[PDB]
Amino acid sequence: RANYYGKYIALRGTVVRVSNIKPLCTKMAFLCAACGEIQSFPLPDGKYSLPTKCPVPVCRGRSFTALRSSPLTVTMDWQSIKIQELMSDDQREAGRIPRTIECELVHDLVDSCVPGDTVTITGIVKVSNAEKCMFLLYIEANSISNSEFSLKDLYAIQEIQAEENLFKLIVNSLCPVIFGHELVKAGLALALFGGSQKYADDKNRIPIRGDPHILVVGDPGLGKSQMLQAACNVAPRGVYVCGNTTTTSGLTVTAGALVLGDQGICGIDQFDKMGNQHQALLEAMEQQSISLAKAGVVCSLPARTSIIAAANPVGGHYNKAKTVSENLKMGSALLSRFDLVFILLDTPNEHHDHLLSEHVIAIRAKPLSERLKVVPGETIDPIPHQLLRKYIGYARQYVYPRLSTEAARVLQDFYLELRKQSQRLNSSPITTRQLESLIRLTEARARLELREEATKEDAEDIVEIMKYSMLGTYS
């Protein structure tokens, strides 16, 4: 605020308002009086002054005339950038935007940054004038970098990796309040990590997306609005937006929600109410890019998003004697892109409700469906979410999984019996996207345990979760 005046400091932030370039002069020359000996007075920081005295050999000075044509005058570049600070800490409920400090680049720099970056800037702090003894604060740049975990962070992540059952401690720690619903939480955990991005045939590429997409559909009152909140909370970059106050210009670039949630989670609630913006996201989530919305005149920008949606059947409660397509009000185009669509039912059992009521009154005071549950009589103390947030960041930029020969046979076999059975039966057509989704999810079950392989049980763990929206559920 005040004390740091003319003191060398360091900063860290993001660039959002890269400006144009206009030259300026610092060593402009002046004319001489009487005899010759042109001089090159050191004009300071682009402020016009006058040489009331000239050293010269002898006699009077004056010589107040400009000579802005001699090669004595030199010119140098200029720019102006503003920096907004990161979330950092101090999660106040107040909606105050972080303070913004301007920056100025002097020479040999410029065109070194683009909108959206993580840069560290070190430079002297100075005070401007004429925004009248009223001024502001700006920083003159001295050095720039481009793009870190502490040693204790490495120790902590190593200790979490040392856990004997890493899968349970992360599948039953995303949200401990909700009782039950283990498979959906497992799917959310799988989607949080992601898979690998294939740049096959580098010369032409045509890159294929390497993250999944998950949709949850079920009866109201089952709690499908907090498992998504917890999932969005534990993420390096996440945004949560309702499906009512947003328009086509809101979701897409008009800076939309999707671009802000780049390399993260952009979970959308109340997906069923949308009836006009459906056809504005297929291209966005398929082509993995979005262009300008003003007549489509190029100007594309990347947008990597992992959309998570939760929806309600059209007729409130979902009846048990009807067809799946009519109870969803969705075409064959927007239903096939999603990898998994869980269907949840609400039935009046006698043991499950008895346990759930006890849990909800206490809070106010083998297949992959039983090995994940917790029997009463032991401690399953969850990892704090603050530590788990810094684990995904390490697991995302230091490990790239690769499929092995052994695991591919199981996926190929599953696809083969899936095709010959979908040939006759009536369901969503089994395209070639199912095999790619299976590959992506098997790659996903190699990044939670911090490994680079694809063993048999890794691929076998994805044929049982797959059988919860597919054949295991169509009946």
Partner 1 sequence: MNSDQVTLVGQVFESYVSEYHKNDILLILKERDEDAHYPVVVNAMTLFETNMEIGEYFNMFPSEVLTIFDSALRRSALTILQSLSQPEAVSMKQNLHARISGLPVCPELVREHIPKTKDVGHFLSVTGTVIRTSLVKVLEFERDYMCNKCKHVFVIKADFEQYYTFCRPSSCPSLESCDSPTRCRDYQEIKIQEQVQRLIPRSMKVILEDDLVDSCKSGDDLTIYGIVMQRWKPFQQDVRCEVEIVLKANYIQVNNDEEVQKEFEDFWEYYKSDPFAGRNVILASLCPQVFGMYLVKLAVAMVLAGGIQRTDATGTRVRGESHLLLVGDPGTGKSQFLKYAAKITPRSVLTTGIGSTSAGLTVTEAGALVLADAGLCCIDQFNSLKEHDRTSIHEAMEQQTISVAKAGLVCKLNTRTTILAATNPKGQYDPQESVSVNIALGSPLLSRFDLILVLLDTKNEDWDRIISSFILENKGYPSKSEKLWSMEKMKTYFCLIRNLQPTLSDVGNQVLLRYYQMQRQSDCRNAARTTIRLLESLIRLAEAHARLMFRDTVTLEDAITVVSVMESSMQGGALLGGVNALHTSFPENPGEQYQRQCELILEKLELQSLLSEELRRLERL
Does position 220 interact with ligand ADP (CB under 6 A)? The reply is: yes
The H or E element that residue 344 is part of is: strand 340-344
User: From the list 51, 61, 223, 243, which residue makes contact with ligand ADP (rule: CB under 6 A)?
Assistant: 223
> For partner 1, which is the closer residue by CB, 154 or 345?
345
> For partner 1, which is the closer residue by CB, 124 or 255?
255
How many Å apart are CA 114 and CA 97, to the nearest integer? 21
Does position 351 interact with partner 1 (CB under 8 A)? The reply is: no
H helix runs in 216-337, sequence order: 227-233, 248-251, 257-260, 282-286
User: From the list 18, 137, 222, 450, which residue makes contact with ligand ADP (rule: CB under 6 A)?
Assistant: 222
Whether the CB-CB separation of 239 and 246 falls below 8 Å is answered with no
Site for Mg ion in 256-285 (CB under 5 A): 269
Site for Mg ion in 335-374 (CB under 5 A): none
User: From the list 71, 221, 275, 348, which residue makes contact with ligand ADP (rule: CB under 6 A)?
Assistant: 221
> For ligand ADP, which is the closer residue by CB, 60 or 354?
354
Check whether 168 is labelled as a binding-site residue.
Answer: no
Under 8 Å CB-to-CB from 123, ≥6 apart: which residues? 8, 103, 139, 140, 141, 142, 143
> For ligand ADP, which is the closer residue by CB, 30 or 271?
271
CA angle (328 as vertex; 253, 309 as ends), nearest 5: 40
Check whether 218 is labelled as a binding-site residue.
Answer: yes
Does position 75 interact with Mg ion (CB under 5 A)? The reply is: no
Burial class (CB in 10 A: 0-12, 13-18, 19+), 42: exposed
Site for partner 1 in 202-221 (CB under 8 A): 203-204, 206, 220-221
Burial 208-220 (b: 16+ CB within 10 A, else e): ebbbbbbbbbbbe
Site for ligand ADP in 381-420 (CB under 6 A): none
Number of residues that bind partner 1 (CB under 8 A): 119
Site for ligand ADP in 235-294 (CB under 6 A): none
> For ligand ADP, which is the closer residue by CB, 157 or 217?
217
Helices 385-396 and 182-193 cross at an angle (nearest 10°) of: 50
Name the segment binding Mg ion (CB under 5 A); options: 90-98, 152-160, 173-181, 221-229: 221-229
How many Å apart are CA 224 and CA 213, to the nearest integer? 16
Lay out the site mask for ligand ADP across 197-216 (x = CB under 6 A, - = otherwise): -----------x--------
Query: From the list partner 1, Mg ion, ligand ADP, none, which binds 180 (C-beta under 5 to 8 Å, kind-based)?
Result: ligand ADP
> For partner 1, which is the closer residue by CB, 39 or 336?
336
> For Mg ion, which is the closer residue by CB, 192 or 268?
268
Question: Could you give phi then psi for residue 461, rounded to 5 degrees?
Answer: -75, -10
Whether the CB-CB separation of 106 and 140 falls below 8 Å is answered with yes
Does position 455 interact with Mg ion (CB under 5 A)? The reply is: no
Check whether 225 is labelled as a binding-site residue.
Answer: yes
Question: 10 Å Cβ neighbour count for 180?
Answer: 14
Question: Which of these, 361, 444, 366, lies nearest to 400 by C-alpha position?
Answer: 444
User: From the list 242, 355, 374, 387, which residue makes contact with partner 1 (rule: CB under 8 A)?
Assistant: 242
Does position 40 interact with Mg ion (CB under 5 A)? The reply is: no
Lay out the site mask for partner 1 across 107-146 (x = CB under 8 A, - = otherwise): ---x----------------x--x--xxxxx---------
Question: Which of these, 145, 86, 75, 76, lies nearest to 112 by C-alpha position?
Answer: 145
- The tokens for 99 are 């303070």
Question: From its phi and psi, is residue 63 left (phi > 0), alpha (psi between -120 and 50) or beta?
Answer: left
- Sign of the four-CA dihedral 172, 212, 223, 471: negative
Does position 225 interact with Mg ion (CB under 5 A)? The reply is: yes
CA dihedral 183, 397, 237, 16 (to 10 degrees): -160
Does position 364 interact with partner 1 (CB under 8 A)? The reply is: yes
Check whether 256 is labelled as a binding-site residue.
Answer: no
Does position 329 interact with partner 1 (CB under 8 A)? The reply is: no
Residues lying near ligand ADP in the complex (CB under 6 A) are found at 177-180, 208, 220-225, 356, 360, 432, 436
